[PDB]
Design a protein around this ligand. Structure first.
Ligand code: HEM
Ligand SMILES: O=N[O-]
Ligand SMILES: O=N[O-]
Ligand SMILES: O=N[O-]
Ligand SMILES: O=N[O-]
Ligand SMILES: O=N[O-]
Ligand SMILES: O=N[O-]
Ligand SMILES: O=N[O-]
Length: 154
């Protein structure tokens, strides 16, 4: 559960490379999630009509969304676990407005790791992927606890 500082530094070193082009990494991650787990795309009323990866790549609104998502996760990871304030509104919206089960949070965690593994082998070898997995597990564990407080079974 609690990450060491060395683990957080591996997380934030690969995140630094994401931040060279957040919009590009958000397209790759959302696309990989929708292609790997098509049922997740059904949660997005604004995007669920998109039929192909081409359409998804060409969607200016999907790209803006990817930037929103990754910048919110970035701000969470930069808290190195002290993320209670940031998780409150995110848990509430994803529980009550969007109804995102923890299993779908696991799917997007898998999509993040796939994309960083593909793009960043210089900063995402086994130890670094292990540290990112632990950070994402922590995030899901803390969101699951907030979901239960908010009444949503997740
Ligand atoms: C790393 C995990 C995730 C983060 C950091 C994240 C972040 C965000 C943020 C910041 C927003 C905009 C503000 C809000 O409504 O809260 C948003 C909207 C949304 N999220 Fe997520 N999200 C995550 C995972 C998911 C997953 C896995 C799904 C669905 C399978 C999902 C579905 C949505 C929907 C449907 C919206 C509204 C999109 C729209 O404006 O049309 N989220 N998310
Ligand atoms: O102290 N590195 O986990
Ligand atoms: O869309 N900027 O977080
Ligand atoms: O794509 N997460 O909103
Ligand atoms: O730190 N949990 O919200
Ligand atoms: O609580 N956000 O929809
Ligand atoms: O996107 N999951 O390998
Ligand atoms: O990824 N080999 O450390």
């Amino acid at each position: 559960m609690v990450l060491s500082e060395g683990e957080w530094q591996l997380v934030l070193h690969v995140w630094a490379k994401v931040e060279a082009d957040v919009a590009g990494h958000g397209q790759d991650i959302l696309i990989r999630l929708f292609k790997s787990h098509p049922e997740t795309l059904e949660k997005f009323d604004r995007f669920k009509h998109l039929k192909t990866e081409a359409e998804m790549k060409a969607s200016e609104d999907l790209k803006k969304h990817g930037v929103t998502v990754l910048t919110a996760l970035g701000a969470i990871l930069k808290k190195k676990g002290h993320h209670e304030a940031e998780l409150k509104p995110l848990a509430q919206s994803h529980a009550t407005k969007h109804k995102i089960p923890i299993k779908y949070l696991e799917f997007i965690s898998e999509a993040i790791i796939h994309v960083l593994h593909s793009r960043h082998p210089g900063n995402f070898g086994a130890d670094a992927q292990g540290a990112m997995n632990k950070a994402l597990e922590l995030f899901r564990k803390d969101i699951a606890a907030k979901y239960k407080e908010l009444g949503y079974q997740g």
